[PDB]
């Protein structure tokens, strides 16, 4: 530093 | 292709019903994000040697916590008994990560 | 378990900052692992319009629980012998991040 950025 | 660890930290969409805690306000359902996961670095903590004067603090320590890395601030608007508005803030997660413990995120603005 | 908060042992040289003092080598114990509790952070709601707290978390850490005091004291140029303290962890258990 441990993957989400919403339409 | 190995899909990874889902225990990791990464985000959750969740809905969640405002309202206030004391006024008559029209509650209002809003989309949520949070954080959780465990974060692979362990954390660790260490013993420092002193000569001077014994220690305030005697440790060196490291640990990582599932936080948001970016965010989006919004603002809900609230409509109450006496047809006076009420607006409510809140950040929006975008993305997770995870940092140290100790490290935060200053508000005061800087002249 | 291998991976949970525990007791790990390893070696390390004790020197004085700045004195020229004969080298010490001593085991010391850290405390290092995965805790199980998962940490996470939550949005706050403000009805004020300004967010100085946006968020509640929670993150556990592994931690000191127990530990001893120890002086040792170290051969140093002159004839002198210089005395220095550390912690040796005795237990260590998984702790909430901001106490």
């Known amino acids: ?7 | 292709i190995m899909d990874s660890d889902p225990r990791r930290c990464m985000r959750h969409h969740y809905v969640d019903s405002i309202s206030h805690p004391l006024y008559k306000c029209s509650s209002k359902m809003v989309l949520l994000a949070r954080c959780e996961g465990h974060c692979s670095q362990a954390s660790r903590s260490e013993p420092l040697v002193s000569f001077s004067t014994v220690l305030k603090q005697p440790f060196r320590s490291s640990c990582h916590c599932c936080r948001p890395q970016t965010s989006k601030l919004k603002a809900l608007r609230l409509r109450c008994s006496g047809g006076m508005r009420l607006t409510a803030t809140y950040r929006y997660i975008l993305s997770c990560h995870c940092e140290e413990c100790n490290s935060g995120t200053e508000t005061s603005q800087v002249a």
């Open chain 1, 1 to 7: 530093x441990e993957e989400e950025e919403e339409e």
